Amino acid sequence: HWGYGKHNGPEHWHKDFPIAKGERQSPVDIDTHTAKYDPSLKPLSVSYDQATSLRILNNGHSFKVNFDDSQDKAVLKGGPLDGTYRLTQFHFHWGSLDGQGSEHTVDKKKYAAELHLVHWNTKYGDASKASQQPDGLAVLGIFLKVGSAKPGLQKVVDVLDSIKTKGKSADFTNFDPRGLLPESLDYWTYPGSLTTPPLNETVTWIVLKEPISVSSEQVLKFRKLNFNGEGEPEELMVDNWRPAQPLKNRQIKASFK
Ligand SMILES: NS(=O)(=O)c1cc(C(=O)O)c(Cl)cc1Cl
Ligand SMILES: [Zn+2]
């Protein structure tokens, strides 16, 4: 029932998900002048060499690639994290135009899209249990700007016409998420939430400073997806982003400079 339209969009979500007006909601605006360099952050470790992708799916609100997380294959450690977080899926948020699409903003600037690599704390055994714990999830967020093509994204864009409508899935094995990362692992970090219902306040956000560049042709392919199921009125899947939420009593910490 929830979505991104006038009648079911982010301003409505609080009726079914009252935590929408909570104390640690995401996304937020990252005020780069107010964020404090934190010398106690350990190096961030993105270890994706053994990642095992499975399937790609149109879920009616985004498209998602899932991974085999039955063992420690692709993990995130270090930075603000304690222990080991396993990669379970990635998805994206994007706009109708190149100047909007991202969920996080940087001094109020919106990027064309945002990649979320979703990970869960292995001390909780499974992703369901992890998603109910204050330190259960970690999302590595990566901004996309339009410019030069991103080669490591092209395999994703080329399969999207096989999952046009809600509920469609396709095989998506042997995909390497290392091809989605920028050069720098400089980041901002803060405690927050899922940006989609049920908006659980269980996420350590790690947002990279350096965007990746993607071509206009790559982002245009994202905008050909549909929110609707096959044989319903066609509604293009665009502007599937939640706007910035109040920071409230939270500090954003920077890993750099
Ligand atoms: N946008 S987000 O906050 O990364 C997020 C989205 C989803 C979703 O698939 O919609 C899930 Cl299950 C978990 C997280 Cl953590
Ligand atoms: Zn997301």
Kindly state if the Cβ of 195 falls inside 6 Å of ligand 1: yes
Tokens 């190149």 correspond to 98
Taking CA 157 as the corner, what is the angle to CA 138 and CA 208, rounded to the nearest 5 degrees? 30
* Cβ atoms 15, 248 nearer than 8 A: no
Q: Which amino acid is at 155?
A: K
User: How many angstroms does the Cα of residue 194 sit away from the middle of ligand 1?
Assistant: 5
User: Are the beta carbons of 253 and 190 closer than 8 angstroms?
Assistant: yes
CA trace torsion 216, 169, 172, 160 (10° rounding): -20
The answer to whether residues 120 and 203 touch, using CB atoms and an 8 Å cutoff, is: no
Q: Where are the beta strands (DSSP E) in the chain?
A: 29-30, 36-37, 44-47, 53-58, 63-67, 75-78, 85-94, 105-106, 113-121, 137-146, 169-171, 187-192, 203-208, 212-214, 253-254
Q: What is the DSSP letter of 218?
A: H
CA distances from 102 to 25, 36, 57 (A): 16, 22, 20
Is-contact 202 194, C-beta < 8 A? yes
**Is 14 labeled as catalytic in the residue annotation?**
no
Pick the residue whose CA is nearest to atom 13 on ligand 1: 194
Residue carrying the six token digits 């991974």: 67
Residue 174 amino acid letter: N
**Resolution of this structure in Å:** 1.6
| Mutational test site, ligand 1, from 116, 117, 135, max ligand atoms within 8 Å of CB | 116
Ligand 1 atom 10, closest CA: 196
Rounded CA gap, 82 and 75, in Å? 12
Give the CA diameter of the chain.
Answer: 54
For the domain 1-257, what is the CATH superfamily, name and number? Answer: Alpha carbonic anhydrase (3.10.200.10)
Report which of 73, 43, 87, 61 is spatially closest to residue 184, judged by C-alpha positions: 43
Say if CB 236 and CB 94 are below 8 A apart.
no
Question: Which residues, other chains included, contact 59 with Cβ-Cβ below 8 Å and sequence gap of 6+?
Answer: 166, 167
Residue 108 contacts by C-beta under 8 Å, 6 or more apart in sequence?
A: 29
Percent helix, strand, coil in the chain (nearest 5)?
Answer: 15, 30, 55
| Secondary structure element (H or E) that encloses residue 219, with its range | helix 216-222
Q: Smallest Cα–Cα separation from 20: which of 142, 192, 140? A: 192
Question: Six-digit token pair at 63?
Answer: 């498209």
Residue nearest to atom 14 of ligand 1 (CA): 194
Distance CA 69, CA 121 (A): 11
Every domain of the chain and the residues it spans: 1-257
Distance 42 CA to ligand 1 centre (A): 25
- Whole-number Å distance, alpha carbon 118 to ligand 2 midpoint, is 8
Nearest of 207, 249, 240, 196 to residue 19 by alpha carbon: 196
Q: What Rg value do the Cα atoms of the chain yield, rounded?
A: 17
Nearest to residue 14, comparing CAs of 246, 251, 191, 237? 246
Residue 94 near residue 112 (C-beta atoms within 8 A): yes
Annotated binding site for Zn(2+): 91, 93, 116
Phi and psi, residue 160, nearest 5°: -65, -30
Which atom, in ligand 1's list, is nearest to the CA of 195? 3
Measured in Å, residue 103 CA sits from the centre of ligand 2 at 8
Write the residue with the smallest CA distance to atom 7 of ligand 1. 196
- For the purposes of burial, counting CB atoms within 10 Å of the CB of 58, is it exposed (0-12), middle (13-18) or buried (19 or more)? buried
Beta bridge partners of 114: 93, 143
